[PDB]
Each structure stands twice: as C-alpha cells, then as structure tokens.
C-alpha cells in the first residue's frame, strides 16, 4: 500500500520470517567457524 | 642344540595353588657331556595376549597387544651379565636339580583363560643361555585362582525380589493379565551349587507360556592401539532352561529346590575390572515364551560367580574334586595352534573345582 | 540422666547433619544412618508428648523443604547450555552466564512485583470501566484523531510515539482516581508509589543476600593470605571443568608458561630499566585517553542539545542520543584495549587499568546523560509554561536507549565474532601477512566488559522503571535474547584464551559494582520524587504538588498534629549531620574491627 | 520405579542431589554401558554393578583429566579397577558446587597422595608435576619447583605437607572452589 | 655503588632505631652504638652535596624533635602526686588521675582556643571603645543604674546576675558590629561561630588520636584473644607499681583468692539453681530502679516548670533546678549500689549492671533537662514577644548547674570520705556492732562513678560553651580543685579495695563513653545553630534571622549564584534519605561481614 | 651538666629518658648511699660505679616486690651481687611506660626463669608461684596450677614454654602493660 | 555593715581566711585517718 506506511510492514514481516528460518537452521546445526589448533599449525608450517 | 641337551623337565609338588600362597618347584636338567654355559635363569611371567581383527577402508588390520601382570626373576646357575670375570662355571655331566621358591602377591590377579581374541597365561620360563649356540627355552604353565571373591560381603547376603504384571487389553478389562513374582535368597553362587528360587505365576491369556532362563556370557575385548581404538562385542548363551507350561487362566508356583535342580554349568568366574584388557560378566535373562515363540517381560540379573560358599563354623573339611573344563563354555571352544602337536591331546587346559554328585552308597 | 540424653541427641543430630561433610564411604554412611534411625526409634519411647509433637513438626517442615527444593530444581532453566559452555571453555567464562541467569531471575521477580499490583489492576479496571471513568481517562488513554493518522510511519512507532505513547508501557496511561472502584477500594497512586519503593528495596535485599552468601558461607577462609605463589599456581592450577582436548592443551601451556615466568622472576630479582620513549608513550596514551573521554562528553552533550524539538516536526534528528551513547558504550572499550598495546606491563594490572577506564567512562556517561536530560526537560517545561507530560517523555528516552543498546550489541556480536571469524577462516590463506598469528587473531570472550554491559543495562532499567512500569517486562525479553546470542557467539566463533587472569579474583566484585550502580540510580529517582512537581494532565500524581504527598496525606490523616510537628524537627540539617557523622564513625569502628580480625586470622 | 521412596530419601540425605539429579545420574550410568547395567536396579544392584576404570575414563568430563585414574581409584570401593553406581554418586556429589569447602579439601587431599600414608612426600608431588605438565619440564626445573613448594608450605621442617597443613595453606586460595568443581 | 650505599644506610638506620627497643645488655647496646657511629662516619664521605644537605636537614629535624620532647617534659604537672597514689593504691586507681590530667589538658586547650580568638580581642576593643560603639552596646555591656545598686544581694551574685551577667563570660556581652575595629577588620561574629566549630573539631580529634595511640600503637596484638585464664591470672597476677606493705599483702591475698575461686569453678563445672524468691527480688529491684529513674524525670520536669519567673520576683525558688538535678546525680548512684545488694551475683556483671544503670540515669536526666529548658525558654520568649535574651539565660542555667555540681561533689567527699572515716575510727570501739567488719567499712575508691562524673561535667561544658564562652575557664578551676581534693581524700580517708575489677579491661572504654557523650552534646548545639533564631537585643548574632547566616553571607560574597544553586540541591531530603539507607545497609552488611571474619579467625 | 654531652646523648639514645629523668635517677642513686657514689661522675665513672643488691632492694619501689632478687640478677652485669648505674638506668628504662610491649615481654620472660636456660620449666614456674603466693597454697594446689598452665600454654608438647609461646600467650592480656610498669 | 549587701561579704572573707588556714597547715602534715590491718588484727585478738 502506502510506501511509508505499509512497505515497512512488509519488509519487517519478510525479515522476521527470514530471521526465524535462519535461527531454526542454526539451532539444529553445530557449525564451528574456528579451526582446531592442529590444522592451523599444519597450515602455518606449510 | 638338541644334540647337547639330553633331558629337560620342570617339576612341582602341586599344580594348583591359591592366591597369596608360596609356590615351590624344580628344574631337572640332564646332559651327557660338558657344555659351556654362561648361565641358566628362571622367570615368572603372567601375560595377557589379545589379537583383534578389523577392516578399515577395505584393508584387514590385525591389532596385537600384550600385558605383563606378573614379572619375577631369580638366578639359578652361572654368573650375571654384569660379571666381567671370564671364569665361566662349568656344569658337570649328569643330572642336576635346581629348586626355586616364590611368593604370590596378595593383590587380585586375573584368572587364566584361552580364547581366540584373548589369552591369559601364567608361566615359568627357564632359559639356559649358551655361547655360540641357540639358548633353549622351557615354558611351564599353571592356573591362578582369582579374583578374591568372598561370599560374606554385605552386597551378596541381601535377598532379591522382583515382580511384574502385563495386561494385553484396556486396563478396564482385567482379562488377559500375566503376572510374575520371583524371590532369590542371594546373588552370589558357587560353580556346581544349586540355586534356590521361588516364584508365583498367574496366566490369564489364551495360550500357554514357558519361563525361559538364559545365562549369557558377555566377553568384551578392548584394544587401545589406535586413534579411536577397536572393541570386540561377543555374546553367547551359556545355558537355557525352560519351565513347565502354565495352563490358560490359571496360576502356578515354581521352586528349583522342590521341582528339579537347575544345574549351573562349569563356568569361568566373574572377572570385572581385574584386568584392563578383557571384561567378562554374566547376565541371567528371564522371559516368557508363548507357543508361537514371542518373548515378553524380559528381566535381567547380574550374576556373581564366587568360590567360597556361605560358611558358618562347623564347616566340612575342604577337599573337593578337580575336573576338566566343559567344552560348551568360553575358554574351551578354541585352542591356540601352538598348543596342538600335529583323539586330540592338548598340552595345557584349565582345571576347575566341583563336588561329586550324590553317591547313594 | 536428662543432660546425658540431651547431649547424646545433640551428638546424633550433629552427626546426621554433618554427614554430608564427612569423607566416608556410601556403605559406612548408610550404616550410620541406620544406626541413628535405630537409636531414634529406641529413644522415641523416652520423651513426652510435647517432644513428639516438636519431632513430627520438624519432620513435616523438612519434608516440605525437600519437596520445595525438588520442585525448584524443575524450574531452573539453561542448565545443559551452561554445562556445555563450562566443559568446553572453562569455569571463568561460565560465571558470566550464571550471573546473567541470576539477573534474569531478579528481573522476573521485579516484573512480577510491578505487574500484579500496578498494571493488572489498572487494566482490569479499564476493562469494566464505566462511562464516567472513560470520560475522565480519554485524555490519557486514547490517541487523538489528529495524530492517529500518523500512528505508524516507520518513525513514530520506532520512537515509541503514537500507539505506544498511550500504552500501559508508560506511566501516564494510568488513572488519577484515588479509588479504582467501589467495594474494592484500591488506592492506585499509593500502590504505584509503594511498588516503586518495594522494587528498590527488593533489589537491595537480593544483592545484599547474594553478597552475604558468597562472602560468609562461601569464602570466609580466604582472609589473611600472603605469598604462597607456587602453592596457588600449582595446587589449584588445573581446571577440573575443562573437558576438551585443545582447551586442556592451552591450559597446560599456560600453566607451564606461568611457572617458568614465576621462576625466572624469582631467580634474577632485578628490575632496572628506564627508557624515555616508553615514558613518553605512557604519558601520550594517558593524555589521549582523557582527550577521548572529553570528546565523548562533548558528543553526548551535543546530541542532547540538538534534540531541541518537542513537536513532531522532524524525527531524523530526534533519534540521535539513542545512537550516540550506545555507539560510545560499544566502541570506546575496544579502543581502550588497543591503548593497552602502548602500555605494556603485567596482564593482571593491564586488565585492572582497562576495567578502571571502562568503569570511569560508563559512570561519566551516565551522570552526564542524567544531567543533560534534566536540564533539557526543565528548559522544555519553562518554555511551555495542556501542560506536557514529562514522566512519559523520560520513559520514552530510557526505553529508546535500551532498545538501541540491544540492537548495537547484536550488531557488534555479528561483526566482531561471526563475520570476522568467517573472514579469517576463508581469507587468511591468501592475505598479505600472517593475520592468523597477528593482531586480529580469532577473538576471545571478554568476561569483564560483558558483565559491565549487563550492569549498565540493569542500571538504566532501575533508573527508568518509575516512569514506565513495563520496562522490566521488556528487559526480560532483552536479557533472554542477550543470553542466547552470547551463548551462540561464544560456542560458534570464539576460542579459549591462551592465558586468562582476573581483575579481582573475588566473587563479590561485580556485585560490588552492581550495588554501587544501584545506589547511583536510586539517587536520581529519590531527587525526582522529593523535589520535582508532577504534571497536571497525566499519571496518578496529577492531583498533588509533590510526588510524596500521596503517602503523607495518608500519614497526616491518622496521626495527631503535635506529634507530627515534633517528629518533623528531626529532619533539620543540624540534627541530621551528627547522624551521618555517627554512622561514619561506627563504620570506621567496624573497619578497625575487620582489620583486627584479619590480622588475627593471618 | 527404579528407586524406592526410602532409597531416594537416603540418597538425598547422604548426598547433595535431588531426585532429578539422581535420575539423570542413573541415566548417565546406563548410557555408559547399557548391557552391564540392568534396566531395574532396585535393591543392592547399585552396589554390585560396576564398570572398569577405562570405560569411565572415556566420558567427556574426565576424558582430559590428567588425574582421571587417581580420581577413579580414590572414589572407588574396596575393589581395584571397579567403580560402582554408589561410588559414582559420591564422586559427582563431592565435586558438586553445593558441597562445602571442607569436603572438597578432604577429598582433594585424599586424591593428591599416592602411597596412602596421609602425607604428601617428594615422590607424590614430583609425580603430580610430571602428570599435570605432561613431562614438558626439565628435571632440574621440577626439582626447583618441588623445593620451593616444600620450603614455602611447611612449618615443622619435615619436608612434607599434612592434611591440617594442606587445609591451612590451600584454603586461602580463591581459585580452589572454582577449579575443584565438576558439573554433571 | 648507589644500591650498596642505600642498603648500608638503611641497615644503619634500622640498627640506630631498634637499639632502644632491643632486649640486649647495656654494654652490648653501647658496643652496637659505637659500631653504628663508626660506620656512619666512614659512610659520610661517599655521597654528593645534595645528599649531605638532606642528611643535615634530617638530623636538624631530629634535633628539634628531641628538644621539643625535652621542653614538653618540663611542663607536665602533678607527677609525684600520681606516683604516690599509684604506689599506695595500685595502677587501677591512678588510671582515674591520668584520665583527669588528660581531661585538664583538653580543657586548657579548649580555653586557649576560645580565649585567643574571642574574649581577648573583644576586651581589647572594649578598652578602646569609641563614643558611638559605647552608645550602641550600653544596653548589653553596662549594667543599668536601676539594677546597679542591687548588684550584690547574697542571691543576685549567686545566680550570676548583676555584675556577672554583663561580663564577657556570657554570650550577650559581645557587640553586633561586623568589624571589631579599624586596621584589624576582625569579624567578631564569624570568629564566634568558627571558634564554636573548632572546639568540637579539636575535641573529636583529640579523643580519636588518644584512642588510636592507646589501641593501634600500644595493644595492636591484644585482638583475637581466647582462654589463657591461668596465664593471665598468674603471669599478670602481680601489680609491680604497688610499693606499700599493706597494699602488697592485700593484693597477695586477692590473687590467692582469684586462683582458688577459679580452680573451684573449673573443677565442679555444675551450675544448677532455681529459687523463686531470688527471682522475685531481682524483678522487684529492676522495677524499683525504673520507678526511681522515672521519679528523677518527674522531679527534673517539675523543677524546670516551676521556674516560670524571669524577673527578680523571687530567688529562693528560681535556684531549685540546679540544686535538685545535681543532688540526683550525686545521691541516686549510691542507692543503686544498695539495690545491687538484693541482686547478688558475680561482681563483674554486678559492676557492669551498675555502670549501665548509672549511664542510663545520666542520659535520661540530660535529655529531660535539655528538653524542659528549651521548651521553657521558647514558651517564655513567646509570652514576652527590648526582647529577652534566651541564650544568656540558658548559659546562666548551665553555669549554675556546674557550680552547684562542684559544691555538692565537695560536700559528698567531705561527708562520705572524711566524716565517715573519722566516725568509724573514733566510734568503732564502743559501737553496738562491729561496723568495721560490717557494711560501712572505711570507704573504697570508685573509679567508674568518678570518671562518669568527669565525663558528665565535660558534657555540660560542651553543651554550654556556645552561650558562655568562658565556661571552660571556670571548668579548669573546677577540675583542678576536684583533682586536688580527690587526691587528698584518697590519701587521707580511703583504704585499698580487697578486690578491684574493670568494666571492660580496655583502655578505650571511658574514652568511648566520652566520644558518645560528645556526639550527644553536638546534637543539641547543632540543632540550635540550624533551627533556632537569635535574639535581636543581645549577642553578635542579633542582626541575622538565623545563627549560621554569618557564614553564608561570607560564602555568597565570593561564590557565584549558579554554582551555589547547583550545590544546594544536593542537600535535598531525597538525596540524603537514600544516603541514610545506604549507611544503614552497609552497617548491617559489615556487621554480618565482621561476624563472618571473626568466625573464620576462630 | 654533671654528665658530658656525649654521655647524656648516648644515654638518651639507648634508654627512653630525657635529661630531667636522668638527673632525677642520678639523685636517687646518690641517695641510696652517699658514701660510695661520687658527686662528680664524668667519664668512665658509671661503668665502674656499682653497689650491692641489698642496697638496691632497700628503696621503696622494689621493697615489696617478691621478685626483687630475680629482677636485680637479670638486669645485672656479669658481676654477681653488684648493680651498676648503667644497669640501674636500663632496669628503670625498660620498666617505664614508654618502652614498647615487645621489650617488656622479652624482659619479663627473662625474669621469670630461674635456671637460666631460656626455658620455663616446671621447677621455675613452681618457684615463681611459691614466691608470688607467699606459701599460702597447698602443694596439690601448686601442682594443679602448674598442670593447667602447662596444658593450656603449650603447642609443641615439650612441657615447657619458650619465648615465642610466651609472646603469643601473654601479649594478648590487657592487664600486662598496665602491671609491668614502675614509675620513677 | 549592710545585712543583705555586706554581711554575706564579711562571712565570705571570714570563711575564705579560715579555709586558707585549714589548707595551709593540713597540706604539710601527713595525717592518716584509716588504721592499718595490723591494728585491726590486734584489736580483734584482744
Ligand atoms: C552619635 C552620637 O553621639 N550618639 C549619641 C548616643 C547617645 O546615647 C544619645 C543620647 O540621646 O545621643 C547620641 O547623639
Ligand atoms: Ca565476542
Ligand atoms: Ca548489552
Ligand atoms: Ca605420601
Ligand atoms: Ca552534674
Ligand atoms: Ca572517695
Ligand atoms: Ca629457664
Ligand atoms: Ca613450647
């Protein structure tokens, strides 16, 4: 509807469902961005 | 060299001893000519040897590990390796006897067993080191009775009671009920001893049920060599007993001491946490088997195999018979290839204790 | 005789109660319990009926306490999460999460107290309100039609204006009626005042109770300690909580380094060095820190001054001091740590310097914000002198500050930990230099700064819970989000510190900061209640010239005039200053007392 | 009903664990080895059901503990190499946070010795150094540390630390309760 | 070798300082001194000129300190008197005399402070007063010719009327002029206020310093003591200062009795007894003590109320409040001891109970007298309203109370000590019963009661030194007369006690009571300064609507109005009441904290 | 003055006295016996000026003290039965109220022994009790007092009290510095 | 002279002179009113 009264509502709803989806995925996974010190040492040595 | 040694023997006054006792023996060596010998030594070694076969990435890997539980040595004849004297003692031709005495430690020692994946052997190794020739070795095996299990322990004197009931329909309809109650006086038992059981059964089903009791020997072999390690899961039913069938919509009472003796088979003693390399425990499984083979209401008991019965003073004099092990239990079904020379005869085999059956006359 | 039996009973009770403190086996413990039970059964037929009544009452009380403990253990949340963070990262990081869980409990209790007695009665009365009550409360509970068209504009709802400005979230939503309704006789302004007082009283109660529990019953044996360096760094040098391979390896390396450095220092015992460059760097950094603090002061003052509009003329500038303050609170600490590179010394005193600078920054920002808000609001009142509502405006300011703080904290977590970690992982192989072994690193969980964040947020809540009854209720959700995001960030993007020290090595240090901030926050509410004049068109205190009147109007109606006049003379400054002097003197007496006892236990 | 009402009452009275904690510990005990522990353990079954120290060492709590074997031995029953459910309960209730400082000090002292003579000798402390550091220190450095420890923590000049001396010296450490703690 | 020189100089300084404190043989100390002086002479020519100048300054400062100590030792009076009283009666009786000598020093310092800055410049200005100043102050300095003829009437002078009312001694003699005279510009009212503040400041400083020197620097190791009964009753069981055969024999028998009773108590260890009669007697004694205290309150109130006349209508009844109150303070304590006969128990606790009851009586009499006096003056000022001078009248009441206290104390000493001792000596031969072996005896010195009398008199001095600047000048003479009379009486009429105890066995018990009384006396002077309004026809504060104004008008002349307005709001009740709550909370927390610390120590 | 500047400066350094106190002590010392003590006393004279113990015990300050002989013997020089001016001044300088608590404690411990082995044995304390009580207690009473003193004031179980134990025990007494004091 | 203006003054000077005389002589003397315990014991024995 209005670009200043309803576009923000749609953007917020899309952001909310995207945030819920992102939270859900993370909740069932155990991503570990840092690497173990052993492989870091082997990479640094080579 | 076989051409130089004429006779080699190891002799003991007794073949089985108890934990903590003093063991005595002798080595008899007979030679015909003078042989230069730096020395002859005797060692005591109790070794656990485990071999586990695994498959990784399509490649078969054999993991071999050893544990030395007993390590005692004593010089019998000659000079030590640190003796720099060149005067080597000479043993005169003929027969010579060297006696030796050792004391077993009071700590718990794992019992001997012979299996494909794990073998525990307590032995004496006599080495006659000889210059410019291969040193002969003589190995003699014996059986260590353990662990030290005493039936007066408070954990074993308490009675055990169990009960269960199952309804095949909606609780409202009491029809189809199956109820069992079992009481045992204790949990520790001696090989060859009768187990006292009492039980009440109520069966309201349309088909008869039989009480199946199975003794399951769980023998787990664990090796440590490896990033993750390899374990062996091994389970067998030692013996199975079936109770008389119970009529439909009826009740019955059962007692081993009154109906028939539930014969416990000659089995190795319970060995839990005495040796790190193998775990052995006994599970008594009780279930009800229908005419179609369906099992339900499984009850598991941990079984303890003791050696000393519950003894009050005015106890009978000790001697009870020694007999050969049964072939239907673990420890007798497999023999190492090094033990058979070629009616099969085995060089060494465990000997267990039993009381002779009721001789009427 | 009777004395012997009483002594035997006392000994048995002492053995039973102290049994949990004896290093005995389970079999021996069970045998002792059975023997005590048999002795109690034997002595049962030895006493009279009254003793049996006391015994059964004690047994029932113990059973009720045990049942309450069992039920309470069912309502304690976030146990597995705390256990996992502990066994992966240690027992110094997890203290933050335990403290946050206790803070959430305190905020839940505060919300319950502020909700059963203020918000719920008012909303219940509004639901069944008659025509007259609606006519009286329309000016405060209904948005005017002129501004209703602009109720949602991505700026009105973001500033808590419009639909939120007339919500139970603010103080002005409530009625002025002394009586909420007939046959019930609920005093609304009195309940409001008493709830505001009781919340502060309960905060003091909880903080002091936890302090006493951690001090007397937990660490009363730590007093009078000296030297014992190797005993402290070797006998209590292993963390039993660690259950990870890399964490254990880092701990082993840290303890080896600690022992080696301690022995190296104790061997040479020579510390002689004087570099003019080092002293110049130290003085330059200490000057620049004060310059940056003055810059923060000027920035917050400029932000509060530029928001000089009361009408809804523009909103892209009124939203500044929400965004300036928070930014500083989340950017200045990190730069502080960078200054620690110039000041190279012992990591323990480096952490002490960092904590001191951060605490000074937070206190200065808080005091300046309060002064600026009060000056601006008094200027607005003087200019306007229907009349504007000031409590609701202050509630708007505090809630906006809290919300922008939460948003900036989320942004900082997503940038410093998540995005930085992914960038390092996927871009350190081909970068210009060895940035994995350089300054950037991976990122370590700073316990001190985050606990200071929690304390500052709770201080803002305490300051602003009078003008907005439903601020603790929002703070519950804020703290839950904070705990979950902190747990995810620490488990997913952070590595254990190679060596970790503590600013105080004491349990009641952060609670000391919390109590100090509670007092610094109860000062302005006290001043506002005592001196400031309520608005005439909003809130339940619009019928009085002072906030406190609703209490004394109750006191003066039930107490005689002569006794009240005699009592009022206590408040003279010349009778009060001696009281303050006496309190300081007795505190000084106890401080010598404390000192003496400590010397004794040495 | 795995545990009776009176059994749970005695478990709560002896230890620092509520019914939920006891049930969780039973679940962990079962998950260690499902075959060896029966589903019903009512009675004296906890006293007779034991696991070897190697199996218990595999759990994540004690996996990286340098003194896992010492802890298992100290908290074990009269048997050697066996750890039972009751001893498991005692081990995790002594380590718990709600246990007072006295019990933690007593069991830490009883863990820290090896011979069992109620005294901390040079051999015991050297072995603790070599186990905790993982043989990463030189012998001279280890000896220097041991000498400092005995000279700065002994008042009778016996080169040994007793239980009372231990409780006097290490109870003033603020990190002991934080470190000597296991969550389970 | 700067480090070696510093170490050597430190060792030499320690050796020099610790020589007097080392338990060495005298020749060993001399040998150490020669070694130290030789090493110092050798080390002299090792350093530069600046170090030599610093050493010269240090040794010159030590020389000044030694010379000052020597000079101070020449101005310490009453040495042989205390020495002889000590050698005759012990080291517990002489504690009262040392305390009284310290009190005399404190009072002399107070008199000097109040005399250099107030009375002397005022009298100097009056001696050179001009015609205009004389005309202005005739109504307050020069006695009217109407009353000048009746200046002496055997009752006017005894009431401090007539020539005494118009002397500097009283408040109203000092002129209202802002400046005493030209070229000096001495602000008399400002000097008055500043001296009144400095008196209390110096009293607090002296009491705190003496307590610190007695506790911190003397018995710092006396804290945390337990058991050691027989060591303390055997190793410290002899008084070394006793030098009389009779006193030595008495203390020998006393220590024998202490050991025997201690052994008897520690052997039997059984305390079981319950008599209804003794309980009834104890409760009756406690009830009659309260009733007798209430009788004291009623008598004081009636005495102040009946003195409703201000003019010289009659003087045989106007002098009934100083006389009656005094006699209570001197007659009520003794009967207390008689009541202690009914409540028989351990002397220690009986003496502690007597001290508590006497302290309660003195405090209640002080409070009632001050309340009645202030109320009577307020009522009389309202009835009369040139205006009457209430401050001068209150000063007259305080001075008359002090003088009547001195007269009654002298009479009590002459009757209880002299007359009773003479009667026993000259009448025990043919008396009806052996009074010498009965309740009378000869008279034992009571240290606690007399120290309490000294403390109470000093309390009256503190309370009344604002309305009468030269009250300490009178109190110096009163204390000197009291000390001489007490010494003569203890030599000539008293006998050593068979067993004398201490209420607390601490050197800071009477000083603690003195500090509490100082606070109790700074309460009403502070209230008068803060609340009451000065008279317009007397004193140098007649030109202000309040007492403290003379300070504020001096602050406002040099301080801007904006900063003054900012600093005013801090004293708001809503900032002070939270401070009182904070101090109460920290007091309770430190009390519990102190408790925990003591538990740990034990 | 009668003393040289060096002499009185040294006396002020070692002792706790001012010029007036030293002059007064000189006057008292002369008053003990006018014949032997010279009026002029500059130089080495105080080191050689000695009098018998009986002359010192005649003054009223120590006339009634039961332990006068022990005090003079403890404060005396190597010579037996002779007390010098320096020893007299040290004796009345430690006893003064200005001397710190440590010095009084040390000299009291030195005085209270009899054999002189730096150890307070049973016989020493028994003799001290018999001197203080003036033989007004039974033998069993003395034995009980001795047993209580030994059992309550011993930490190493040596049946004796050393200087450290004495300081730890009687320095906490509030009546010590008040009693261990003689004004002069 | 005067009964209310001078008689009290004359009594005051007389009393002051008498008190000065009492203080003077007494201060020099060393009177000890109480009797020693030896005299008490001697009286009790007799
Ligand atoms: C300025 C001056 O001389 N003051 C005097 C005064 C005096 O008391 C008064 C009597 O009427 O007369 C005034 O003139
Ligand atoms: Ca982070
Ligand atoms: Ca935050
Ligand atoms: Ca040991
Ligand atoms: Ca008085
Ligand atoms: Ca007297
Ligand atoms: Ca001795
Ligand atoms: Ca000793």
From TrEMBL, chains A, G:
Residues passing through the membrane, by range: 7-29
Protein name stated in the entry: Transmembrane inner ear
Parent-protein residues present: 18 to 63 of 117
Automatic annotation (TrEMBL), chain B:
GO cellular component, one term: cytoplasm
Superkingdom as given in the UniProt entry: Eukaryota
Example of a GO biological process term: protein transport
Domain Arrestin C-terminal-like: 2-151, 174-310
Family: Belongs to the arrestin family.
Name used for this protein in its record: Arrestin C-terminal-like domain-containing protein
Residues of the full protein shown: 27 to 400 of 469
TrEMBL record, chains D, F:
Keywords on record: Calcium, Magnesium, Metal-binding, Repeat
SUPFAM superfamilies found in the cross-reference section: EF-hand (SSF47473)
Lineage: superkingdom: Eukaryota
Gene that this sequence comes from: calm-1
SMART domains the UniProt entry points to: EFh
One biological process term in Gene Ontology: calcium ion homeostasis
Amino acids binding Ca(2+) 5: 154, 165
Binding positions for Ca(2+) 4 per the UniProt entry: 154, 160, 165
Record GO terms (molecular function): calcium ion binding; magnesium ion binding
InterPro entries documented for this protein: CIBP, EF-hand-dom_pair, EF_hand_dom
Residues involved in Ca(2+) 1 binding: 113, 115, 117, 119, 124
Protein name: EF-hand domain-containing protein
Domain EF-hand intervals: 100-135, 141-176
UniProt keyword Metal-binding present: yes
Pfam family, any one: EF-hand_7
Residues binding Ca(2+) 2, per UniProt: 154, 156, 158, 160, 165
Binding site for Ca(2+) 3: 154, 160
């Amino acid at each position: 509807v209005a670009p200043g009264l309803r576009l923000w509502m749609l953007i917020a709803l899309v952001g909310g469902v995207l945030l819920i989806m992102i939270v859900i995925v993370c909740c069932f996974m155990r991503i570990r961005i840092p690497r173990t010190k052993r492989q870091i040492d082997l990479i640094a040595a080579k | 060299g076989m051409d130089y040694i004429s006779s080699f023997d190891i002799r003991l006054n007794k073949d089985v001893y108890y934990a903590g006792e003093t063991i005595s023996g002798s080595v008899l060596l007979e030679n015909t000519e003078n042989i230069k010998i730096r020395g002859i030594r005797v060692l005591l070694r109790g070794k656990v040897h485990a071999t586990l076969k695994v498959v990784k990435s399509g490649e078969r890997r054999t993991l071999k590990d050893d544990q030395y539980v007993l390590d005692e040595k004593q010089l019998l004849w000659g000079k030590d390796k640190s003796d720099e004297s060149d005067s080597v003692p000479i043993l005169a031709r003929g027969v010579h006897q060297f006696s030796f005495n050792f004391d077993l430690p009071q700590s718990s020692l794992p019992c001997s067993l012979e299996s494909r994946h794990c073998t525990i052997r307590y032995y004496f190794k006599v080495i006659i080191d000889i210059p410019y020739a291969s040193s002969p070795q003589g190995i003699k095996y014996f059986t260590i009775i353990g662990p030290h299990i005493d039936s007066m322990e408070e954990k074993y004197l308490s009675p055990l009671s169990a009960q269960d009931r199952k309804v095949n329909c909606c609780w409202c309809c009491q029809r189809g009920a199956l109820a069992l109650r079992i009481i045992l006086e204790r949990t520790a038992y001696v090989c060859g001893e009768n187990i006292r059981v009492r039980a009440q059964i109520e069966n309201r089903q349309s088909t008869a049920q039989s009480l199946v009791i199975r003794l399951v020997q769980h023998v787990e072999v664990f090796v440590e060599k490896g990033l993750l390690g390899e374990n062996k899961m091994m389970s067998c039913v030692v013996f199975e007993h079936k109770s008389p069938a119970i009529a439909a919509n009826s009740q019955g009472k059962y007692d081993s001491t009154l109906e028939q003796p539930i014969r416990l088979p000659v089995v190795p003693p319970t060995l839990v946490g005495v040796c790190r390399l193998i775990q052995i425990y006994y599970a008594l499984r009780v279930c009800m088997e229908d005419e179609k083979g369906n099992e339900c209401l499984h009850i598991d008991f941990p079984l303890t195999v003791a050696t000393i019965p519950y003894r009050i003073p005015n106890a009978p004099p000790p001697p009870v018979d020694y007999d050969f092990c049964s072939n239907h239990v673990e420890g007798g079904k497999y023999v190492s290839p090094e033990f058979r020379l070629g009616e099969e005869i085995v060089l060494y085999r465990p000997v267990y204790v039993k009381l002779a059956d009721r001789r009427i006359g | 005789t009777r004395q012997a039996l009483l002594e035997r009973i006392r000994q048995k009770k002492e053995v039973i109660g102290k049994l949990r403190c004896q290093a005995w086996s389970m079999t021996r413990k069970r045998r002792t319990l059975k023997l005590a039970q048999k002795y109690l059964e034997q002595h049962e037929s030895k006493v009279s009926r009254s003793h049996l009544y006391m015994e059964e009452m004690r047994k029932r009380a113990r059973l009720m306490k045990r049942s309450f403990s069992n039920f309470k253990t069912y309502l304690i949340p976030w146990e597995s999460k705390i256990k996992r963070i502990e066994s992966h990262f240690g027992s110094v990081v997890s203290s933050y999460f335990t403290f946050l869980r206790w803070i959430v409990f305190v905020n839940i209790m505060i919300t319950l107290i502020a909700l059963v007695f203020v918000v719920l009665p008012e909303t219940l009365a509004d639901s069944v309100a008659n025509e007259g009550r609606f006519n009286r409360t329309k000016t405060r509970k209904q948005i005017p039609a002129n501004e209703r068209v602009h109720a949602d504009e991505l700026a009105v709802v973001w500033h808590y204006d419009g639909y939120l400005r007339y919500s139970p979230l603010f103080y002005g939503y409530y009625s002025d009626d002394p009586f909420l309704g007939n046959k019930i006789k609920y005093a609304l302004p009195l309940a409001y005042f008493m709830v505001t007082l009781t919340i502060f009283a309960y905060s003091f109660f909880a903080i002091l109770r936890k302090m006493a529990a951690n001090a007397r019953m937990s660490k009363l044996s730590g007093s009078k300690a000296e030297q014992y360096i190797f005993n402290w760094k070797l006998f209590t040098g292993w963390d039993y909580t660690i259950g990870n391979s890399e964490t254990a390896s880092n701990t082993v390396m840290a303890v080896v380094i600690k022992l080696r450095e301690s022995i190296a220092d104790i061997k040479k015992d020579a510390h002689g060095k004087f570099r003019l460059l080092q002293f110049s760097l130290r003085v330059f950094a200490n000057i620049i820190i004060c310059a940056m603090l003055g810059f923060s002061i000027y920035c917050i003052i400029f932000a509060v001054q530029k928001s000089q509009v009361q009408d809804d003329g523009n909103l892209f500038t009124k939203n500044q001091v929400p965004s300036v303050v928070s930014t500083i609170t989340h950017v200045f600490p990190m730069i502080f740590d960078l200054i620690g590179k110039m000041e190279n010394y012992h990591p323990r005193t480096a952490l002490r310097a960092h904590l001191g600078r951060v605490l000074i920054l937070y206190t200065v920002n808080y005091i300046t914000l309060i002064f600026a808000l009060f000056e601006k609001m008094t200027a607005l009142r003087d200019r306007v002198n229907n009349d504007i509502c000031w409590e609701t405006i202050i509630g708007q300011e505090i809630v906006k500050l809290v919300t922008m703080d939460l948003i900036f904290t989320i942004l900082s977590i997503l940038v410093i930990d998540l995005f930085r970690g992914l960038w390092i992982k996927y871009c350190s192989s081909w970068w210009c230099w060895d940035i994995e072994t350089t300054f950037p690193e991976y990122g370590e969980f700073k316990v001190a700064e985050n606990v200071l964040h929690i304390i500052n947020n709770q201080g803002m809540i305490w300051l602003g819970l009078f003008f907005a009854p439903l601020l603790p209720a929002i703070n519950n959700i804020k703290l839950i989000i904070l705990m979950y995001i902190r747990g995810w960030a620490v488990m997913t993007c952070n590595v254990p510190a190679r060596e970790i020290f503590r600013a105080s090595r004491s349990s009641n240090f952060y609670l000391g900061i919390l109590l100090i901030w509670l007092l610094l926050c109860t000062l302005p509410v006290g001043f506002v209640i005592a001196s400031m004049s309520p608005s005439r068109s909003c809130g339940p205190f619009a019928r009085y010239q002072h906030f406190y009147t609703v209490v004394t109007r109750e006191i003066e109606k039930r107490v005689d005039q002569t006794v009240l006049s005699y009592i009022r003379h206590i408040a003279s400054p010349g009778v009060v200053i001696p009281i303050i002097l006496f309190l300081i003197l007795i505190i000084y007496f106890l401080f010598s007392l404390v000192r003496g006892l400590r010397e004794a236990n040495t | 009903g795995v545990f009776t009402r009176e059994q749970l009452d005695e478990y709560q009275d002896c230890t620092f664990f509520t019914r939920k904690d006891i049930i969780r510990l039973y679940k962990r005990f079962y998950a260690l080895n499902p075959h060896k522990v029966p589903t019903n353990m009512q009675g004296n079954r906890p006293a007779i059901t034991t696991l070897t120290f190697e199996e218990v060492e595999k759990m994540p709590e004690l996996k990286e503990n340098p003194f896992k074997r010492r802890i298992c031995e100290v908290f074990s029953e009269d048997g050697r190499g066996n750890l039972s459910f009751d001893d498991f309960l005692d081990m995790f209730s002594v380590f718990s946070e709600m246990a007072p400082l006295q019990l933690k000090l007593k069991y830490a002292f009883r863990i820290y010795d090896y011979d069992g003579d109620e005294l901390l000798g040079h051999d015991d402390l050297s072995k603790m150094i070599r186990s905790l550091t993982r043989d990463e220190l030189s012998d001279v450095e280890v000896e220097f540390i041991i000498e400092r420890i005995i000279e700065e923590a002994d008042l009778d000049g016996d080169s040994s630390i007793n239980f009372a001396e231990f409780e006097h010296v290490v109870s003033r450490s603020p990190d002991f309760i934080r470190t000597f703690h296991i969550r389970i």
